[PDB]
Amino acid sequence: MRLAYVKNHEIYGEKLLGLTLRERIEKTLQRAGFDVRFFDELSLEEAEDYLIILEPVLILERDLLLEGRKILVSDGFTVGYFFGGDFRTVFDGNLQSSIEKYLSLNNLESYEIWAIKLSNDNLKTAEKLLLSSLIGSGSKYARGLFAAIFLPIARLLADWGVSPDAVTVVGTLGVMAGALIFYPMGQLFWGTVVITVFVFSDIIDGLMARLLFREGPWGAFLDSYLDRVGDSSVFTGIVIWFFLGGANPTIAILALICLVLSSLVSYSKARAEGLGLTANVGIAERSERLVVVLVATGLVGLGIPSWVLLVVLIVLAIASVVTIFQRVLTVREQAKAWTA
Amino acid sequence: MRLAYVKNHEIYGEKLLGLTLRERIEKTLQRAGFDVRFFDELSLEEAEDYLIILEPVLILERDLLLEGRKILVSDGFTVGYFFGGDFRTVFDGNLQSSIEKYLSLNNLESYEIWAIKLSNDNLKTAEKLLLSSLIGSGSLNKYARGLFAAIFLPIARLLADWGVSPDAVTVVGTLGVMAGALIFYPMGQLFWGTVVITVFVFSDIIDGLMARLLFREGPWGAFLDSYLDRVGDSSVFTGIVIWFFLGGANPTIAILALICLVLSSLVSYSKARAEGLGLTANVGIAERSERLVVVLVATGLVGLGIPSWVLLVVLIVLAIASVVTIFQRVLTVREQAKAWTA
Ligand SMILES: [Mg+2]
Ligand SMILES: [Mg+2]
Ligand SMILES: [Mg+2]
Ligand SMILES: [Mg+2]
């Protein structure tokens, strides 16, 4: 059993991005496999590991792995100590004496972590940093600019108490509204701007789920599922429009083939992960495919010749096919390697 | 190291459903984590576990779990003995004496297994039983089940003798379905397309049987079956959609087919992704073969000239069933996740 004692502070009560700093550090430490005890004055319990944080601190590092005794530091600051169970036979109720004694007794290296010391003045800074910590793998210059463009939305939704599931669902309904209503009507441009607007909700729900500590398998599932639904709806709309009012059967056929191939490309990865093996490899990514399809469709909606769309649909189809082939090949390799 | 000694016989060399009985028992014992030694006369080696099979026997039980010393029996028959390492200090070179002495020394309980004693006369029977043990059929009458196994015995024999792999069967079958769906249907031949698809559809059951029979049960097999099954169904709906959007001149049917295509993809993806996440969802009102049956029968009927609204109705009902299936799966995985946090 691992125990972590954190000292109470005045600033731990402040609310940051929907949680308090106290609950946030507590849940953070919980993610590290520690049972958290808040203390004004320490009463030690029998256990194996002891992680002692004194000064108020915001830990920005996502995965913290603590193995063996050591000292926790950020930019010259000492944020906390990690002592083993032996320290229970040391601590006499005086802090510095027991610390310096355990340090004279034990030789410990220094471990670098991503953290910021809390102060009343730098809270804004802390918030900014916290926002920056959520990112990746993202777009690195572009990533920095990126955090800047999606930071206010995440901040706003976090402050209003909006859940990420709500965001995912609303976004998908928006995409469905653009794809299944405007497109069959023959409005390709406005449909495209609606879809494009409500598509970034995937990245939004990821930031909010990460920010609010909710995460989980359900979260991952929902993002993936609704993402699939979204793409399928987009292609469905294209297919419908060009089969009827668009009066272009060949585009409609290519779009339909792309719909099916998309479903199959997603299903390959999903089913593979289901068998316990893995396949992340493919040339075609959801956002890139989305981008080319949306840009082409929008262009055609502004009057660009439809053969551009024909070409892009051909290329996307072929890319989906070779991606499928790649995935099937690597899962084959994995299986045959697993049997041996 | 675990050792299993099986005594050599004249009939072990005979080939049954593509393998010899000898290789079959050896590979069976290999699946149990045993190193197999075939012997005309026993030479014992130092080891931990000793599994001794004397009489020629075809073991029909799939998973055999052996923990601790015990006696192996099938329907009153005693098929073999399981002795520990101590038996190395017993065997003096006589078989019967050391076995009966060790049986007099040690009290071992009796474990029931599914197996059949080999004889020259009953070979046909054995073949039948093995076949019957390998094939599943969902919700089939025991008469219907017997009949079904009876109709696939010649097929299994033929494919086993010709050297055809189960992968070959799955792929060929899927190509057949695709040939029916993406060629005949867009041409406007719904009936013949339907008969092509219906003919090449049973290949799923065939590849399951062959993969089980030839002992290739691995993760690759499951992957390939699932994937090509998805490809097949998607191709079927794709064909329907294409035909009815252009020459079939029925936009509402085409739309219903497209919606069903998407919902099908989503219903499958739900299960695949759920399993990927480590949770499970086997629950839904709709099963693949039943859906296949109603769709194919309706489409074929329309292809023989029956009015297309029948197909419209069946597509609506199938759509709704897919939707509620989606609800069940999403709801239960939600329940599981929320239950997992608690
Ligand atoms: Mg998302
Ligand atoms: Mg996503
Ligand atoms: Mg099969
Ligand atoms: Mg199958």
Residue numbers in the entry:
A (entry chain A): -137 to 1, 4 to 204
B (entry chain D): -137 to 204
Give the authors' words.
Subsequently, we determined the structure of a construct containing the complete RsPIPS sequence (absent the initiating methionine; RsPIPS-FL) in complex with CDP-DAG at 3.6 Å resolution, again by molecular replacement, in this instance using RsPIPS-Δ6N as search model. In contrast, although crystals of RsPIPS-FL only diffracted to lower resolution (3.6 Å), a structure of the complex with CDP-DAG was obtained readily. The structure of the complex of CDP-DAG bound to RsPIPS-FL revealed strong density for CDP, with the nucleotide ring wedged between TMs 2 and 3, and the diphosphate moiety coordinated by a bound magnesium ion that also interacts with conserved aspartate residues of the CDP-AP signature sequence. This groove is entirely absent in the two previous structures of CDP-APs, which have a small, hydrophilic pocket in this location, consistent with their preference for soluble donor moieties such as CDP-glycerol and CDP-inositol. A unique feature of the structure of RsPIPS when compared with Af2299 and AfDIPP synthase is the presence of a hydrophobic crevice between JM1, TM2 and TM5, which in the structure of RsPIPS-FL accommodates the lipid substrate. The nucleotide is wedged between TM2 and TM3 in a pocket, which is also lined by TM1. The CDP interacts with residues from the signature sequence on TM2 and TM3.
In the initial step, phosphatidylinositol-phosphate (PIP) synthases generate PIP using L-myo-inositol-1-phosphate (inositol phosphate) as the acceptor alcohol and CDP-DAG as the donor substrate; subsequently, the terminal phosphate is removed by an as-yet-unidentified phosphatase to yield PI4. RsPIPS adopts a homodimeric architecture similar to those previously observed in Af2299 and AfDIPP synthase, with each protomer possessing six TM helices surrounding a large polar cavity.
